[PDB]
């Protein structure tokens, strides 16, 4: 009865569209305010950049991608305290009672 | 609509995001949300699926 809740493990997640901030080489790190929030999936990376895509220098430019995370379906985990287990036992005698 | 008895050592090693019961943050979201290498200025996500 009422086992203690330990963890929720999520197996179905819906995402929102990714958001990108990026900067040219030697122009600093890219920042998103979504990156300081605990419900967003984010990542830092560097991308190849140059004259062909809007940068004066050829090299690794900072880039950050963030998407808002919500759990759609999650499995719950409860701990089992063996000292709280209940059982029910049914007993009866052969005395000629009709099964009804 | 389903339930089982599972080993704690198995469950704690699941490569899935997990929460702490309350209105808690989702930890290790990357087990279902990966990001792919950027091309120039564009990254799209890899949703690993249900």
């Amino acid at each position: 009865d009422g086992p203690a809740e330990a963890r929720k493990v999520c197996y179905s997640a819906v995402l929102t569209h990714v958001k990108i901030n990026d900067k040219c080489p030697s122009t600093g790190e890219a920042h998103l305010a979504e990156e300081n929030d605990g419900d967003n999936a984010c990542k830092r990376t560097y991308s190849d950049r140059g004259w062909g895509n809007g940068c004066g220098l050829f090299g690794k430019g900072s880039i950050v991608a963030c998407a808002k995370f919500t759990c759609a379906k999650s499995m719950s985990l409860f701990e089992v305290d063996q000292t709280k287990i209940q059982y029910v036992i049914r007993a009866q005698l052969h005395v000629g009672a009709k099964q009804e | 609509k389903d339930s089982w008895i599972v080993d704690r050592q198995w469950a704690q090693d699941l490569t899935l995001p997990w929460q702490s019961g309350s209105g808690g943050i989702w930890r290790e979201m990357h087990h279902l949300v990966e990001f792919e290498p950027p091309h120039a200025a564009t990254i799209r996500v890899l949703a690993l699926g249900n």
Partner: antibody
Amino acid sequence: VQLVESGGGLVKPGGSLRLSCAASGFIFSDYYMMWIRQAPGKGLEWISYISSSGSQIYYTESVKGRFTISRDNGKNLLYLQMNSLRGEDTALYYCATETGWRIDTWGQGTLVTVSS
Amino acid sequence: QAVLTQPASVSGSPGQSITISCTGTGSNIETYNLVSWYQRHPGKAPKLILYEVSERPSGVSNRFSGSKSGNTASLTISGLQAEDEADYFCCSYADTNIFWVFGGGTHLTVLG
């Protein structure tokens, strides 16, 4: 933290206009910007949408080939270049910030009326 | 698609509590649950009063509350005041394709 909008007025159909949005009070270059408008008797409608760097651009199909959203992060300015103007483009246009996948802050609005 | 329909005009008396609903009619709304409400006095900028259905921006009064049940998001204002005479716009992130969708708009009338 405010957004000032300018550029509105009266202009003939098939004309050309440029709306402007000046931002103050935060790092403009780290926030998604976007243009909204509202027509008479019609609900609000976001029409243009740009990323922090300007490398990601989104339009609605109603203004896709005509409007061109741009941003100058040195001047903390957001522009809406409205070419090939039409009658239905008569609306009150807002510039708005976008963080946390919501429309956070708004400008006061500039009015464009197009009359033949 | 995604269509948000809300009443054109609602009214209440000072000191009363009033509710403005926002009924969703699209394909799959019910997926992200980040509905936002906005307040606009005539000639000024819209002001964010609620986002993520119930959450409130810093400095927003506690008389403004919001809830959801199914395809309807509701904005409720208690302790009605003459300052609340304004337009209230509903907004919801529909999907990854078309983004946020707006309602038609409701004009609150405070019976002063």
